[PDB]
Write a protein that binds this ligand. Sequence first.
Ligand SMILES: [Zn+2]
Ligand SMILES: [Zn+2]
Length: 228
Amino acid sequence: GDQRFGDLVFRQLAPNVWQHTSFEEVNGWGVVPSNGLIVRDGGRVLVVDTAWTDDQTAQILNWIKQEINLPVALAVVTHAHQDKMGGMDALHAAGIATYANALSNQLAPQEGMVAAQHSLTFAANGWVEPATAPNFGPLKVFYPGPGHTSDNITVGIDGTDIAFGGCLIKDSKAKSLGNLGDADTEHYAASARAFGAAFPKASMIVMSHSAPDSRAAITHTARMADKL
Ligand SMILES: [Zn+2]
Ligand SMILES: [Zn+2]
């Protein structure tokens, strides 16, 4: 079921999980949807990724205030690209603590993005170091390796059958991995598979530019990456 607030679209995926969608015209691609998540965790709300712009991100915050009416404690952004970090200033103006891979924060200035306030670091097995992600509630953050970008991270939602692949994962019907300009073509397949292995039971795979899919999205993405 889809709900609308301004230029955004919201779809409920689980009793306490919603997908947020914002659009931007991208040369050679079209009017591209970018998806993120909204998670209600007891008396607070957690956000995964911004919208493409500050104005669109402010609309996510206003929709949370209206439909959920619980304060937004934090946001995790999954890499330093406009569709995931374009709205950082809107989060900061609202007093929301922001987190990103330390590498995302390092790359953010070069990418024309505003860095997150806090940096996440990861173990050699890809799992986030818990001292860098305190009070993340059901969010389980995993760095699968370089793929779509060198800094892309993924998030699993504990207590649900959902795992969010961000821009690393394409749906099971995709014909390419899209723009490979910032991609790691040598490690993409292994990174896609590391994401699948980190959340081995998730049956609903959420991704940035397609509607939620089955685990066939992971298998297919990795098969496409094997040809690179
Ligand atoms: Zn990207
Ligand atoms: Zn993307």
